[PDB]
Amino acid sequence: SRCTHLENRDFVTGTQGTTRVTLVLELGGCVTITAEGKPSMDVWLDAIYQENPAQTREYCLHAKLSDTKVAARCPTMGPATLAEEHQGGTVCKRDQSDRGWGNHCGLFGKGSIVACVKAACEAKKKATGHVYDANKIVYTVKVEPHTGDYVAANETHSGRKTASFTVSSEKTILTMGEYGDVSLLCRVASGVDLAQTVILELDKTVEHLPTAWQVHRDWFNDLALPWKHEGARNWNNAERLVEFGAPHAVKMDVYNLGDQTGVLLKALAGVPVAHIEGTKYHLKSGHVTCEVGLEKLKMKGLTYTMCDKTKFTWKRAPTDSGHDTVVMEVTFSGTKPCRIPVRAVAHGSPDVNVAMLITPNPTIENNGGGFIEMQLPPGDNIIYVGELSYQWFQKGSSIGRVFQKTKKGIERLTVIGEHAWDFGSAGGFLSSIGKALHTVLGGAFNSIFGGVGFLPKLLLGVALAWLGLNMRNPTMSMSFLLAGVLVLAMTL
Amino acid sequence: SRCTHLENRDFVTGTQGTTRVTLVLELGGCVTITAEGKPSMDVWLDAIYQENPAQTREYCLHAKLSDTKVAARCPTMGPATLAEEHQGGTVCKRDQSDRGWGNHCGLFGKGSIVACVKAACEAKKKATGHVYDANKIVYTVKVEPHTGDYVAANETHSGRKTASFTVSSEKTILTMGEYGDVSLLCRVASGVDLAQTVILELDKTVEHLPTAWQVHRDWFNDLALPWKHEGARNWNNAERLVEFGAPHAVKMDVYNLGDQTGVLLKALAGVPVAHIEGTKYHLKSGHVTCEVGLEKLKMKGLTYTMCDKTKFTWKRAPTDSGHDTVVMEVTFSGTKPCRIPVRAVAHGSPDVNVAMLITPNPTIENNGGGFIEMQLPPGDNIIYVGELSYQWFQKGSSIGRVFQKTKKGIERLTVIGEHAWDFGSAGGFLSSIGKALHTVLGGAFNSIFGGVGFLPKLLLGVALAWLGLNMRNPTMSMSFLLAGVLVLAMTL
Amino acid sequence: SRCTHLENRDFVTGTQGTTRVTLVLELGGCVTITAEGKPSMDVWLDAIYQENPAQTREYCLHAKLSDTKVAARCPTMGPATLAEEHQGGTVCKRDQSDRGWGNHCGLFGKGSIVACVKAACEAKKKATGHVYDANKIVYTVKVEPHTGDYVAANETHSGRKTASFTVSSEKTILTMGEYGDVSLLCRVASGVDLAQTVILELDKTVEHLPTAWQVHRDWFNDLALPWKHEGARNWNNAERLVEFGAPHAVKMDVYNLGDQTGVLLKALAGVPVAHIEGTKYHLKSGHVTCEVGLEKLKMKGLTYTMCDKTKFTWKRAPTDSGHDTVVMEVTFSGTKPCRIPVRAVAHGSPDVNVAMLITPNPTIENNGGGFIEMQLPPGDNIIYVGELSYQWFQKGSSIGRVFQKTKKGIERLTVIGEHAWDFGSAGGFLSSIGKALHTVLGGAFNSIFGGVGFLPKLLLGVALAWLGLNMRNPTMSMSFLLAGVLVLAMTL
Amino acid sequence: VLIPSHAQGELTGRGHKWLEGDSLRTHLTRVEGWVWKNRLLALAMVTVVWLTLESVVTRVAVLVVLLCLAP
Amino acid sequence: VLIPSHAQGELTGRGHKWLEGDSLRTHLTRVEGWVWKNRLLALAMVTVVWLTLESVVTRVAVLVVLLCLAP
Amino acid sequence: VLIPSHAQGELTGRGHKWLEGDSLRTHLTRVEGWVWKNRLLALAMVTVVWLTLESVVTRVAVLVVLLCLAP
Ligand SMILES: *[C@@H]1O[C@H](CO)[C@@H](O)[C@H](O)[C@H]1NC(C)=O
Ligand SMILES: *[C@@H]1O[C@H](CO)[C@@H](O)[C@H](O)[C@H]1NC(C)=O
Ligand SMILES: *[C@@H]1O[C@H](CO)[C@@H](O)[C@H](O)[C@H]1NC(C)=O
16 A cells, blocks of 8 residues: 555545535545445545646846946947847947046046946756646546555555546546446536746756756746747846946946855745656646546455465564554465455454454455555554454544544644545535635735735735724724734645 | 638627627628538628729829029119019028128118928828729628638639628628528628728838828828929928028028928828729728628538548647637548547536537548547537547636637727627617617717827816815716716727 | 118227127127227127037938847747847837737737837938037137128128137137227137037928037937947937837737928927038138227328318218118218218207218228218208208107117027026126126026926916915915016017 | 927028928917817906906016916 | 827727827826926925915815826 | 844945945835836825724834835
């Protein structure tokens, strides 16, 4: 199970009749689908990329200056000109100096002076942007069934199937070995908002840096540096890295502003990174609302016999999973294949199996099987595998796990979860109303307040709260409700 | 489809029973007629011209002066005369100078002096006006059927038929290939108000200028320049370009006022241009209320079979149309001809085709076909062409497209739309009342306020608004209603 | 006498003791200096010029356009560039067009487009400015003594001496034949305000125009046309004559604004003209406060005898002078030289000479003499030249001539007379106080209200007058005094 | 584009100029131009005089200005 | 002599014109032209606002007009 | 990480410096940057002036500060 590897994990239930499940496959997560009568599956979003996308504005972070040429004129002798006041990639600035008799002028006052330098760009100092064409973006969803084996991250699981999802895909039927088939319908349009996402790329050959980034569109198109496009020979706004000193009446000094990489890297405080692999431009933060059909699945090995109750041992002892579940691995020595008699009673000599399994129908195969995951109720529990009993104290609480999911559910409701009420399935007056009550409010405070930052949101909300303290009309004293929103909603 | 080329486009519906459609074919627009059971047509106004129309007042923008002759007399010695004080095209001015003994006069005081010059005109500096005879004007309406092919602007479509409309045309039956026939009844009388339209023409051989213009009659007949008619040898009011200095008692200097082209071109701020092609004097702004009969049309290829669902590919991918519709082009490889199984479901696993087509019955022919235009509802949509599915997110809104047409409908109601309530068909208490409630109001504030400009309309309305603030009678306090008109109606 | 030729003429008296006279030699005037015991002189300003002055900003009134090059790009395909977006004398404008499939683009929306033309200038359409260096300007004052001869304007007088006045001249002693010497000290610094005067020059070879003009500095440096300097190959702000139409998605049309000579000539309504003669750039409006010393003068022919009283005749009869004086010319036939016995009695047979002469000591010479100018009191007068009596009726009045000079004195107080209280000599509490009471007021309402024109001065003064009608404080009701200034002072 | 008029400056003058009277009177032919083209509006401003304001001193202050405001 | 402007007529238009914005905004650069050249007079009209009239509705009626009256 | 600016010190100077005007006016282009990007909020702060406080001397004390507080 891949869901046992990483921290973030969500369990999705399903009764007899629940066959269509709408997930929100967020990147860097893993969803375990559990359904009564069906083998449990682990579905996650793997990668989001596009091979060789179109590239927008480049930038120059370190100006390469050469050929300083300065001309000047006496104060009534035809203001100064140069041949390089028109050529491409040349920064020029006109100024009035103070011509004396030291520099041989008939009169005094304000003589014209102008300097021009060739503003090239240093090699491998370009902030190349990239954008995603929605017609060529490739989502990638991988599905792994709970086979009862265990495969570590260094290794690759056998039955882990992979389904790509371009714009030109409706539904993919995946042959899951002997467990049946699964259908995945991915809304590739309603995934990452590709209109407002620019993949920033510096020199990717530098060792101790991320290969790329993921910046907002409005931020990237409003930088104050020199810029051009692909194939353009000469720059635009090239004076933004070149400053000119006040002249001493014959020469006007030209000052570069050096490298600007450090200023840019400080400006990306709290920006999600992005990976570049060869030509593919991956992402490391995103989501997609794929829908899973479960009607073509079946459990594997219901026709098998029960195992001998004596012949179980341990390759690995039972231990906590970090998700209020229990994981383990047994080893069988008798005749294979057979079903593993797994049960767990709490405390009553009750003969009441309270082991809500995660891997359903655990079966030792002829070459694998043994990994068993279960969820136990809080308190003292005794886990049985045939005639192999282990004490266990489930460290949670009764309301502790309910309070756990709401702590998840609130942090599910990040900007991913602003889009994602659809983690359930057809709530009607529960979830479909949730989309209505949030889009008209969340979308309203994204148009305004969109690109203002944490500190003004923690300030302007308090300012509108303070106007609630000193307000004339009690009808207009309901501006205190914004303190209930602006101090709370967009502060997480 | 020509309607896919340009920005301005209007869709006209038609139910079972709707067979006569009254359009308003405005120039530089395109109207797509859609009717249930009928093949959809694109009807636009193409050109408005008249070969060699009658020409009114010419002008002279650069006076050619020659033969300066000055005569003067001593102050009591019989006031000065000349032979050129009567001849045609000669500007003269009498004045009293100050004769001394330096210029050999017996007495002092005020001696008479007069100068005369021959005021010709420079070649190719004439502001020749032209007017439209309603009996010889030629409207031109072109109709293109939605054939399922695509033809770019460089190319010429096959089935695009062209019908001229003089005053001596009632109805034209157009053979639209195999789609049937269409009847066009153009009210050539009620098109552009030809009484108040003058085609201004300067030197049309000048490279970097428009060949002609389109000015109001009252503006053109009230210029303050020299003028004549065709065949006239000599000018009228020729002193309007010639000014005379105060004399120095023997000679009175004659000063030309140079070229006047620059003053005239600045005076045309916000005037629609007009093109001259050989002898034809086109327009680039106008309209005509042609009526379209649809009873002699039929769809093409209802007897054809359905295509193979596998054998579709793409010459060109689906994309947005800029008119809240979706356009695309498929490529078929099996047996031809056949009907293309086009459908699109939104999101319910519904098997409900919500693709309101614009090109009806899309059919691949033996040598063409594939261009398919449809309008989808807002939200996530999956477009099917047989077994060829594409995700689509329609970027509009539910009320967004209704608010789109009203933004169109208001800007439809320009001076074109002041005439045009007739874009529907027989509204009765909807549209025929609209003609009544607007002609008596719009015509009233065209008689007054007609030829005053934006700034006085934004001033005199506020002045009559300000009188509403300080008014004696509450019955006469309803002059505030003019602020509801003059600040709003004639300010767009 | 040159002062008898033209209309404008001022007489300056001088008593026994008056030897230094401070004049204001305004251009296009003539001053007759009269002094008791001294021969009367005619001093005028003749010409103000500078040979080949420095030339400031040129202009272009008619743009010469060529080489239209247009490039365009599909809406997400790297916004359009050209090689001519940098070269000198090239106007370019970027715009967003509407790219379709008619012009072969993958997507729709707003495709970039840009056009560039070579903005040269038409030959002989340049508004060349010129300014006056105070170190090289040449004033020219000519002094003619009343010799008793007469010389017309076609002819040149013998004793008319000419003295130039650069910055490098202090005083010039002029040998006036036998009348003695005269000293002229010209304040060349305090003449025309050369800092705020620009000589505008169009094509001077054009027949029916003035050769040059004289405009204010602040007006000339704030035109909105293309401009350069001498020797500059390419223009600045060359887009001010070129306008670009909205593109039709492949080509963007480039429209010239034609000649602009007519707009410029209408903008010079009320500007004093200036003449160009070869290389010299004259003026036709100006003044200079030269001071005339009279100490080295003496009357000519006091040692001569009186003429025979019988032998006078007339070359030209007595007649009016147009300056309330009487001019005539006698012819003598006896022995020459001798003094002419001129007298005139009014009416009493009184033998009382009331002929206040202008030409003192009228003497017939061996080759000339006879022109006699006098001023007579109003009424019937009998003019005697020896034994040669003529009736005369002086057409003026008693208070008529006093009211004449005050009508002169007010129109003396134009902007010339705003500077000129110094037409007298050392007034102290009369004239030196006049400089004090006017410079602090006239200079105050030149800093403000300087460059506003007749109509706002006739409006803003009435506005400040109207605030006097509705004012709170009686102390602040003295803003009505501005109606006594603004409606009167700067309205002449 | 726009060249402003030089009735602003008006330095001096005893020689020759262009148009002594037409510096002022072109602004007095625009106003006469507004009347003969808009006779229906020239009579419409009579409704200001004897009906609305009835403030003789400031009646003229509306009449003269609103005619001069129309360029 | 004078050619009047044709912002008066304004028939129709869906083709091409000269200057859509500069028919209105040349009259909005004259007024901005009056301010930056006469800063001493721009502050002089502030004396109308808070001192003389004190009639907020009709304060603006003097300010806007007298700026537009100066051509 | 962060290097503070040296507009704090400002010792002396009659020679040459980097940015005489841009030490002050970058703080005058951030504030102008806040306005043109947030026109809906620039008009939202007008509700402070004539509706809430009505305390003319201290109206400006809220307007100037809250614009300068947004970095
Ligand atoms: C799995 O990880 C261990 C870490 O010690 C390593 O020895 C082994 O080579 C890894 N397996 C693979 C296939 O890389
Ligand atoms: C079609 O348009 C393209 C644009 O590049 C042009 O090359 C071609 O000549 C056009 N075709 C015709 C027939 O004019
Ligand atoms: C000057 O003198 C000549 C000599 O006969 C005469 O013909 C001429 O008329 C005079 N000039 C003028 C301008 O009157």
